[model samples]
Target: TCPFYKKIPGTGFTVDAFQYGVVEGCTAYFLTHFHSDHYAGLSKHFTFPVYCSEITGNLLKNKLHVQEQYIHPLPLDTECIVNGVKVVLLDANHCPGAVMILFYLPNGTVILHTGDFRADPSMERSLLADQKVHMLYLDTTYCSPEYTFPSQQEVIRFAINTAFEAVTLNPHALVVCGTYSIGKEKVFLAIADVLGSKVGMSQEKYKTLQCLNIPEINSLITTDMCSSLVHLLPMMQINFKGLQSHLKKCGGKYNQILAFRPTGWTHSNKFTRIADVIPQTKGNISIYGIPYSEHSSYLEMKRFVQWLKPQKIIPTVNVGTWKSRSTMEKYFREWKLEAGY
Candidate 1:
């Protein structure tokens, strides 16, 4: 396991609890989002006050079962004081309530921890216009030239169209849209609203959405299974054997089952179409893998780092496949991000 927390070299404040590990001199613990991998080991036994966005705070209490006392909701785009440190939260645009924590230290240093986000040009321009960012802990999920996919919006549209096409091709089929329990609400919601279909969700997923408590999400969830309905199942539920068993259980009623997994990994190369066919299938179940991602591509990450202009760039997540600090440095140095632009 990697070091769960990123303690700013000299500063003591710890950012994120990746794998439930503790920071040596952690003054405050900040959670970026409610993703289990990112917010691991947050529970009743938690010792520190966790700072995160309001929706994330709700997920922490209801889903993670962390008590209300230790959870603090920091408003997005608002600067607030916690233990004498000036902290501002920026929208990460990865998932609901995901945030980028900016810490303005008393020593005149400004550090930005981009928890998990897809870099958008307008957001980068709007947020980092005049600020001098000292250090940046980057989310290098797609930190190589090989990892390239379309925007999440484009992929969501493709998913919606794919669902429509699948339903048309197999009139008696149930469309199963794969999504993260928390993230990718946009895809499901868009499919529901546009197609005028009520979304079939598992009881667990329904509870998660109920806990989320957003008004737009109120009418879209149900527990029914029918041909007219698009089931927003967890990404794990769309695999080969899982789909086969599910269709086998549905049994002689529906002619086919369409499972669409919306993810970036499906379209990492330049040759792959935005929403191409995955060669894998589960018997009568057709699999359509779309390029839906909430992280920056290599070029986007370069643009973000260049614009932010931090002195040091540290990669987040497990530094295994795509994490290369030299590659990250090469982008900035070769790109030549001039100061005072």
Candidate 2:
């Protein structure tokens, strides 16, 4: 009765493709990427046989570090006949580790489920392999006409400008990243690209994003490219004194520090930690609130669905409408749902 067959407890975040009775009939499961919303079910006690790209397999074993026996690794875009269903992997433009999945059923009914995505021009050459799609399950993160989001490039520019300004002000600030660990590595990359810098993470920290096997996206900062950029490491390490000392040694005494948290967008007033993350000094590190976000604006949602031309587009990550599961659905019904199709 639903696109997803996993029997999720409905306790955590919304799991896409929700359904209860799938594990029994399913000979294989098609997973595109490793976002929790995308493949978190694998962590639960229920073992649903999964079909994923080689990179996705690396992610399961390395990043989540979850050891499981039922998983099988398959290459991207390669079709397989498991229980007579064919699956394809397409690049998803949302995060470095995300992928869009296309499933083909024996009845000529096809389903293209884009778990979550943004139209990243950086990813066009690799993601767009197929022009023919039978059923397009798309990303409508921004479907309303009033919602307008800056493109990834635009967001990158804004972050760079802001980071550059902040860095110019305080030369010895330690950069702390507050963004989600998985999805927005691009934002970090953009910051690096802008600052002409790189953050050094241990092989362990690098292993988190490295498992995806999308080699192009996985290179966070070149192992060779550290000296050119600001030396960066994740926040769990580096005390204020150590960072200031490192910054002073690195020829920066009044440099700025930058950090990102997804909730920082909506929850700005609630969290005082963003301001306190840096050093308390005369160099003066400041926090900048750039509305640069990852998900699409309202109109982008409608446009994405319109462009995909899917037979049935299902919303997976959001919720609120009692009549329709959440607000996104309510909007979909009022603005996009046409029963006559």
Q: Give the alpha-carbon lDDT of every model.
A: 0.74, 0.53
Q: Which 10 residues in a row give candidate 2 its minimum summed lDDT?
A: 5-14
Predicted structure 2, TM vs. truth: 0.68
Tens digits of lDDT, candidate 1, 39-86:
877777786788889999888888878888888898877779988888
Cα error, residue 147 of model 2, in Å, equals 3.3
Worst 10 residues of 1 by lDDT: 1-10
The runs of at least 3 residues in candidate 2 whose Cα sits more than 4 Å from the true structure, single-residue gaps closed, are 1-22, 41-48, 66-69, 119-146, 168-170, 194-196, 202-204, 213-256, 262-283, 323-341
Candidate 2 contains a number of clashing pairs equal to: 25
lDDT of 1: 0.74
lDDT of 2 by residue, 1-341 (tens): 54442221211112243234444444455665666666644553436666566767777776655556756666665665655556666667656546676666666666666767665444334534355456555565554454444455655676667677766665555454443356666566777766656654546656675664544544345444234344445543344554445456545433554554332133332343332323233243333444455566665555455444555446654433454356655665555454323
* Cα misplacement distance, residue 278 of candidate 1 (Å): 5.7
